[PDB]
Amino acid sequence: MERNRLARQIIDTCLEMTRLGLNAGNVSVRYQGGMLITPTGIPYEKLTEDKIVFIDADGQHEQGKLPSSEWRFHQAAYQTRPDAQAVVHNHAVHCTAVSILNRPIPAIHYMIAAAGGNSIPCAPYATFGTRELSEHVAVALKHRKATLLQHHGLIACEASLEKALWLAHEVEVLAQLYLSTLAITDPVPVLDDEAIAIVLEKF
Amino acid sequence: MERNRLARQIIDTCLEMTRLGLNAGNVSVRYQGGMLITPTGIPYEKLTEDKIVFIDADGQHEQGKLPSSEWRFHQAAYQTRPDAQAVVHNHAVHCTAVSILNRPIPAIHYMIAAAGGNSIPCAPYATFGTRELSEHVAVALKHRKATLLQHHGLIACEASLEKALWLAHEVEVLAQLYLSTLAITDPVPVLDDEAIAIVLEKF
Amino acid sequence: MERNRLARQIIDTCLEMTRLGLNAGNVSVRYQGGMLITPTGIPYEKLTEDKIVFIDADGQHEQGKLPSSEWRFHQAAYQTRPDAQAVVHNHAVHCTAVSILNRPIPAIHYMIAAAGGNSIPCAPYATFGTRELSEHVAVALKHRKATLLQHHGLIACEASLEKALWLAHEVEVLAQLYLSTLAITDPVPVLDDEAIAIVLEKF
Amino acid sequence: MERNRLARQIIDTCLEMTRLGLNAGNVSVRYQGGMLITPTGIPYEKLTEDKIVFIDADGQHEQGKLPSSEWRFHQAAYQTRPDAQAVVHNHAVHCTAVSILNRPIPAIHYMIAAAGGNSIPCAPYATFGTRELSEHVAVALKHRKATLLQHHGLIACEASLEKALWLAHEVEVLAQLYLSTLAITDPVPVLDDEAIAIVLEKF
Ligand SMILES: [Mg+2]
Ligand SMILES: [Mg+2]
Ligand SMILES: [Mg+2]
Ligand SMILES: [Mg+2]
Known part of the structure; x- marks a missing residue:
């Protein structure tokens, strides 16, 4: 089963x-015109493969399963970044x-280029799970693979789960660097x- | 045995x-009109189920066992929050x-609402284990599920051990966020x- | 073998x-009028019981073993605190x-009393392993169970290895608290x- | 096989x-007039001994393997420090x-002498993997076993892998100390x- 492996x-x-x-967080993959995503509320240590939620191309989730409350900005990411x-x-x-200060992370370290440019943006606040938040996310991800969310946290997307986790970890290192020097x-x-x-070309 | 499982x-x-x-810390559950609570002095790695202490509804602890020196503000929590x-x-x-600065944690992140409102309070100092400290705790927990204790630490209460630990961890994250930005x-x-x-309604 | 267990x-x-x-660190116990102490240079993960060094009451170490380069202020601690x-x-x-700032840790938290008073002292600098450093340590430990060493680190002593490690960990927490609030x-x-x-009396 | 063990x-x-x-990082040993070095891109948890890359004395790497993109300043270290x-x-x-601030680490703690003097230098920025960066590294390592790299990170070299890792960890502790006090x-x-x-003589 392709789905079980994913x-x-x-x-x-x-x-x-x-x-x-x-x-707190949520993780998804692009899958069959929709996505597979973690469900809401269930702690990671209690997740079984059975509990992962498919959302189709229309936003209709599988019957009997509640997807992550923030699935809409996963959908925004997939629609923005092919x-x-x-x-x-x-x-x-x-x-x-850093997102509480509503500051982008600037080019303090050359690994900033892993997100595609000279910065990690910080998108303006909107209530979690809303369309307003989704639109901000789509704009922030237009030219970047990761973005902060004001008063909220971090979204990172890449070509594989391993690369998206790696990029998420890299942005957290960049954030710690910025806070420590600031x-x-x-x-x-x-x-x-x-x-x-x-650096961008060397990548 | 119900007690052994708890x-x-x-x-x-x-x-x-x-x-x-x-x-350092102590943990309890509501049980049979009193509580089951960790004993004083024994390191967690040396705790056996036998060493957990029952305190009845009157504050009388089991014979031959010394409950946590701070059991009185566990009792205050249970009496304040049904x-x-x-x-x-x-x-x-x-x-x-944060409690050393005698500051509440304000609404720097939307997960502050997990404790019931727009803040984590910081109750005024009183000597550990005293009635004065218990009264401050009762007041702080009236409209919040967690509170800081000035010059002391953190109390968090919830509907299950897993949720109370989760909330305690969430308040520690909020505190780290506040210190880092402050x-x-x-x-x-x-x-x-x-x-x-x-956010409160979405919860 | 008593020595093997210790x-x-x-x-x-x-x-x-x-x-x-x-x-970096070193650990000892009081033993037969002298001490058993970790040897110099050997990483902890490579220590075998055979490598622990006995130093007699005169400062003469066992033949063929080099004790910790800082054994002299372990001896100072044992002579100062019966x-x-x-x-x-x-x-x-x-x-x-904190020791680099040459500041004592003041009474920012009631657990400061675990070292015997209202402070963790910070003894003045002297070269590691010297008699001058030993004398500073002896003075600092007169009324305290733990002390910082300027530009150096921490000494903690107690009635058992478990309690001395616990106190060392408690002073590190107090230090982190002080740095974070300062x-x-x-x-x-x-x-x-x-x-x-x-608090001192409650202890 | 000597190479398999290394x-x-x-x-x-x-x-x-x-x-x-x-x-992120890379590790090498001096070997047969060149070096054995980690390959580029492969996560450490996926490295097998087969994937380690030999670079000869001329900078020609083994066929079919891509060495670390920063192998040139490993070569600079080996040529500078016999x-x-x-x-x-x-x-x-x-x-x-610390390297983002472009500051050396000064003599805030006596363990600074483990790198050979009274400081950890901070070499000026140049693009990773370039000859310009290599020359800066060679200069910084002339009288020191470790150096920061502006906007980049840390290089540490010693007589064994265990000692080089130990020194790298020691410089990270020194850096944390400096940031915390600064x-x-x-x-x-x-x-x-x-x-x-x-202290240098006692070492
Ligand atoms: Mg979120
Ligand atoms: Mg307490
Ligand atoms: Mg020392
Ligand atoms: Mg590098």
């Missing part, structure tokens, strides 16, 4: 995300602290766009 | 609380640092009461 | 100290950061001596 | 480096935050050169 990988990603101190095959959302503490020096020194342009 | 769950919660970096079935107290480092910006941006009102 | 417990304490993120049966020294990061507010609010006097 | 030790070092929260047998590079978060007091108190001179 659901197993979603759970592995969830358990791994908590093990790395990154998780290259996204997996989406990771969490409230990692350093990411979320506490000493405001503004934090950044690399110029020429430096990032060079 | 005592096993109390110990599991304790061991899990230390594994999450949250513990919906509380489990109480978790710890000195989690971020919670406790070090950059004072005051920290907050969501307004309309935003929290919306 | 050496096994020293190693367990060392491995546990690193597991708690507290270790109640000390075990000594833990480490360079735990929060303790050591970054927001200088000076940090403290409990007054009446409050600590009450 | 490649096994490289992988063990990598897995251990991530377990200590220090890793005593280096192993090189560890990572983006440990505290090291990297957030309170700028500049941070340091030991004078006489104190470090004494």
Whole structure:
């Protein structure tokens, strides 16, 4: 079963995300014109493959299962980024602290280019699970693979669950770096766009 | 044995609380008109189900066992909140640092609503184990499921041990968020009461 | 063998100290008029009971074994505190950061009383392993069970290895609390001596 | 096979480096006039001994394997330091935050002498994998066994993989100490050169 393997990988990603101190969250993959996504409320350690929720191309979820309350901005990510095959959302503490300040992460480290440019954006607040929040997410992901969400947390998407988790972890490292330096020096020194342009091509 | 299962769950919660970096503390459940609570002095890794202490409705503990020195504010929690079935107290480092500043945690993140409102209160100091401390705790828990204790730590109560531990962990995340942002910006941006009102209903 | 059991417990304490993120360090017990102490240079994960070093009452170590380079301030602790049966020294990061500022930890939390008073002292710097450093340590431990060492780290002593490790961990928590609050507010609010006097008696 | 044992030790070092929260990175040993080094892109948990890459004395890597994109500054380290047998590079978060400020780590703690002097230098930025970056690294390592790399991370080299990992971990502790104290007091108190001179000889 294709679905069983993917659901197993979603759970592995969830358990791994908590093990790395990154998780609250939700994880999905692109699947058959819709998505497979974690359900609402169930702790990761209690997830079984059976509990993963399919949402079709119309937003109708499987019968008898309640998908993540934030499935709508997973759908927004997939519609915005044709290259996204997996989406990771969490409230990692350093990411979320930066999002409380409503600041993008600037080019403080060359690994910022892993999200596609010279920044991690911070999308404006809207209530979790709403269409307003979805639209902000779609805009933020137009030219970036990851974005902060003001007063909320982090969305990262990539071509595989492993890469989306890796990118989510990388943005959390970037956030910790930014908080640690901002506490000493405001503004934090950044690399110029020429430096990032060079790195972007090397990637 | 009903009591053996509950005592096993109390110990599991304790061991899990230390594994999450949250513990010093004490854990109880509502039971037969009194409570089952961890004993004083015994490290969690040495607790056996036999060592859990029953305190009856009058405050008389089981013969030959010394309950947690802070059992009185577990009793205060149960008397104040009829919906509380489990109480978790710890000195989690971020919670406790905020409590040293004698500040409530404000609405810096929408998950603040998990404790019932727009804030985590910080009750005024009184000596651990005293009636004065119990009264402060009762007042703080009137409209909130968790509270900081000035110069002390954190109390969280919920409908199950798993939910009380989850809430305790959530407040520690909120505290870390507050400390991290306060070090950059004072005051920290907050969501307004309309935003929290919306979130409270979604819960 | 009495010595084999004690050496096994020293190693367990060392491995546990690193597991708690507290270790560089050295651990000893009072033994037969001298001490058993970790050797110099050997990583904790490579220690075998055979490698623990006996130092007699005169400072002569066992033949063929090199004791910890800081054994002299373990000896100072044992001579200063007749109640000390075990000594833990480490360079735990929060303790050591406070010691770099050459500040005592004040009464920011009632658990400060576990070291015997209203403070964790910070002894003045002297080169590791020297007599000058030993004398500073002896003075600092006169009325306290633990002390910081300026530009260095932490010494904690108690009636058992388990209690000395517990106290070392408690001082590291106190140090993290102090650093976290000092970054927001200088000076940090403290409990007054009446409050600590009450707590000291409850202990 | 000599190579199989060394490649096994490289992988063990990598897995251990991530377990200590220090890793992105790359690890090598001096070998047969060139080096054995981790390959590019492969996560440490997926490395097999077969995947370790030999680079000869000329910079020609083994056929069919792509060495770490930063192999050139491993080569720079080996050419600069005849005593280096192993090189560890990572983006440990505290090291990297200090490198974003473009500050050396000064003599805030006597263990700074483990890198050979009174400081951890911070080499000026250049694009990862370039000759310009290699030259900066060579200069920084002339009189030091470890160096920060501006906007990048940390390089540490020593006589064995175990010692290079130990030194890398020690510099990360020093960096965390510096950040923690700098957030309170700028500049941070340091030991004078006489104190470090004494420690250097004791080593
Ligand atoms: Mg969310
Ligand atoms: Mg308490
Ligand atoms: Mg030392
Ligand atoms: Mg690098």
